């Protein structure tokens, strides 16, 4: 049949050479497998390489590809297989055939939210690259690769090539120290590209577009408590409509077109709203203002005006989400709360008032979860509130000390011990999920959890 993807390898194989093919697997299977350990990728990039070889040579067989590949797919099927399998890969495994293929190229990745990557000291780098260079090269790429793996293939590929080259250059070289110091400088732009798409893709791989929009007009409520609707409603559309199209594009630098004129429109409309923002639009290049704007916290927010729950029919146009936007907007520039928890309460709550809209009585739809809702928002916020409590207002050592005192309060018969322990999960918590850029995959579960926990 269609050896589309046959002739796709072959072409790349025989285009690239064996040595580049197989850095560019590495690459490749590397952000596919976040989770897949160095020797379960290197093994799975040994076996599909030495595959290609085979398969593409002069003289192989009509069907040595699809033979050759359903043995791979058999073989991460096995118990203790050699190669790194997705979630619900043995689930997969239970079936055959047509299902088999299918089920498993359906499986999906979740996106990394806690990178480990550390770039070591020059001596190190050295030390270890002249000790196995192809060694040092290989671990690099897997390593930056599963943990960046939600930016770019393309920009990933770029990226490594670069770094190693640099490698290659100022650990060879007589003066290493400043070789490092004006190479890294060359790259830094490539550098924070990467991490910054892999970020902001990684959350928007966990939102979805609906629930990112909505989350990105929470956050820049956050921080400009003080602008109007009209001044943020299009820069968190627009960044949306960027993370829709990089995120899912395999150009390298969809991310670093898009921004610059994304910046300006932001600075145009906030350079004058605020202080950090004006701080912010000083940077020298647009990523630098984006990234500025991106850790920026939420703002220490004014108690504005009490915001009232759109139990109204005015909510019912699909094409118009105006009214549910403007209160978004409003309930996060005056609530004390993390984004995080926001987001995952908006999305119930928001549907909720949906399912009031075609039915018999709408207003008595309406005013009879009215009540109900917003008791059901109020106990989240309040609960949200009390278990961040403290956390934004003192240093992390300053923070433990009055939450410590808190638990005391409620639990006047615990034992230094278990008031320890219960000190460390729940200041553990709050380091994790109560700041405006919390990782939503993360903190959902742990949300849940903590919610229903009487301390």
Same mark, same amino acid.
């Given at each position: 049949?269609?050896?589309?993807?046959?002739?796709?390898?072959?072409?790349?194989?025989?285009?690239?050479?064996?040595?580049?093919?197989?850095?560019?697997?590495?690459?490749?299977?590397?952000?596919?497998?976040?989770?897949?350990?160095?020797?379960?990728?290197?093994?799975?990039?040994?076996?599909?390489?030495?595959?290609?070889?085979?398969?593409?040579?002069?003289?192989?067989?009509?069907?040595?590809?699809?033979?050759?590949?359903?043995?791979?797919?058999?073989?991460?099927?096995?118990?203790?297989?050699?190669?790194?399998?997705?979630?619900?890969?043995?689930?997969?495994?239970?079936?055959?055939?047509?299902?088999?293929?299918?089920?498993?190229?359906?499986?999906?990745?979740?996106?990394?939210?806690?990178?480990?990557?550390?770039?070591?000291?020059?001596?190190?780098?050295?030390?270890?690259?002249?000790?196995?260079?192809?060694?040092?090269?290989?671990?690099?790429?897997?390593?930056?690769?599963?943990?960046?793996?939600?930016?770019?293939?393309?920009?990933?590929?770029?990226?490594?090539?670069?770094?190693?080259?640099?490698?290659?250059?100022?650990?060879?070289?007589?003066?290493?120290?400043?070789?490092?110091?004006?190479?890294?400088?060359?790259?830094?732009?490539?550098?924070?590209?990467?991490?910054?798409?892999?970020?902001?893709?990684?959350?928007?791989?966990?939102?979805?577009?609906?629930?990112?929009?909505?989350?990105?007009?929470?956050?820049?409520?956050?921080?400009?408590?003080?602008?109007?609707?009209?001044?943020?409603?299009? =820069?968190? &559309?627009?960044?949306?409509?960027?993370? @829709?199209?990089? $995120?899912?594009? *395999?150009?390298?630098?969809?991310?670093? #077109? /898009?921004?610059?004129?994304?910046?300006?429109?932001?600075?145009?409309?906030?350079?004058?709203?605020?202080?950090?923002?004006?701080?912010?639009?000083?940077?020298?290049?647009?990523?630098?203002?984006?990234?500025?704007?991106?850790?920026?916290?939420?703002?220490?927010?004014?108690?504005?005006?009490?915001?009232?729950?759109?139990?109204?029919?005015?909510?019912?146009?699909?094409?118009?989400?105006?009214?549910?936007?403007?209160?978004?907007?409003?309930?996060?520039?005056?609530?004390?709360?993390?984004?995080?928890?926001?987001?995952?309460?908006?999305?119930?709550?928001?549907?909720? =008032?949906? &399912?009031?809209?075609?039915?018999?009585? @709408?207003?008595? $739809?309406?005013? *009879?979860?009215?009540?109900?809702?917003? #008791? /059901?928002?109020?106990?989240?916020?309040?609960?949200?509130?009390?278990?961040?409590?403290?956390?934004?207002?003192?240093?992390?050592?300053?923070?433990?000390?009055?939450?410590?005192?808190?638990?005391?309060?409620?639990?006047?018969?615990?034992?230094?011990?278990?008031?320890?322990?219960?000190?460390?999960?729940r200041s553990d918590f709050a380091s994790n999920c109560c700041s405006i850029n919390s990782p939503p995959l993360y903190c959902d579960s742990e949300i849940d959890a903590e919610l229903k926990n009487i301390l």
């Amino acid at each position: 049949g269609r050896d589309y993807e046959k002739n796709k390898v072959c072409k790349e194989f025989s285009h690239l050479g064996k040595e580049d093919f197989t850095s560019l697997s590495l690459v490749l299977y590397s952000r596919k497998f976040p989770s897949g350990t160095f020797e379960q990728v290197s093994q799975l990039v040994k076996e599909v390489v030495s595959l290609t070889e085979a398969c593409c040579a002069e003289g192989a067989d009509p069907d040595c590809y699809d033979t050759r590949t359903s043995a791979l797919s058999a073989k991460s099927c096995e118990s203790n297989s050699p190669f790194p399998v997705h979630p619900g890969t043995a689930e997969c495994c239970t079936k055959e055939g047509l299902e088999r293929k299918l089920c498993m190229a359906a499986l999906k990745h979740q996106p990394q939210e806690f990178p480990t990557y550390v770039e070591p000291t020059n001596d190190e780098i050295c030390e270890a690259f002249r000790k196995d260079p192809k060694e040092y090269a290989n671990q690099f790429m897997w390593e930056y690769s599963t943990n960046y793996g939600q930016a770019p293939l393309s920009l990933l590929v770029s990226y490594t090539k670069s770094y190693l080259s640099m490698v290659g250059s100022c650990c060879t070289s007589a003066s290493p120290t400043v070789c490092f110091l004006k190479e890294r400088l060359q790259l830094k732009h490539l550098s924070l590209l990467t991490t910054l798409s892999n970020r902001v893709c990684s959350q928007y791989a966990a939102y979805g577009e609906k629930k990112s929009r909505l989350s990105n007009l929470i956050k820049l409520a956050q921080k400009v408590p003080t602008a109007d609707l009209e001044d943020v409603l299009p =820069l968190a &559309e627009d960044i949306t409509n960027i993370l @829709s199209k990089c $995120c899912e594009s *395999a150009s390298e630098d969809c991310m670093a #077109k /898009e921004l610059p004129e994304h910046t300006v429109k932001l600075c145009d409309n906030l350079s004058t709203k605020n202080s950090k923002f004006e701080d912010c639009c000083q940077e020298k290049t647009a990523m630098d203002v984006f990234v500025c704007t991106y850790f920026m916290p939420a703002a220490q927010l004014p108690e504005l005006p009490d915001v009232e729950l759109p139990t109204n029919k005015d909510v019912c146009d699909p094409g118009n989400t105006k009214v549910m936007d403007k209160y978004t907007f409003e309930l996060s520039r005056r609530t004390h709360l993390p984004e995080v928890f926001l987001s995952k309460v908006l999305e119930p709550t928001l549907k909720s =008032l949906g &399912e009031c809209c075609d039915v018999e009585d @709408s207003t008595t $739809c309406f005013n *009879a979860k009215g009540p109900l809702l917003k #008791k /059901e928002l109020s106990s989240f916020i309040d609960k949200g509130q009390e278990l961040c409590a403290d956390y934004s207002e003192n240093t992390f050592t300053e923070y433990k000390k009055k939450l410590a005192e808190r638990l005391k309060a409620k639990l006047p018969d615990a034992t230094p011990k278990e008031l320890a322990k219960l000190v460390n999960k729940r200041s553990d918590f709050a380091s994790n999920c109560c700041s405006i850029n919390s990782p939503p995959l993360y903190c959902d579960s742990e949300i849940d959890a903590e919610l229903k926990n009487i301390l």
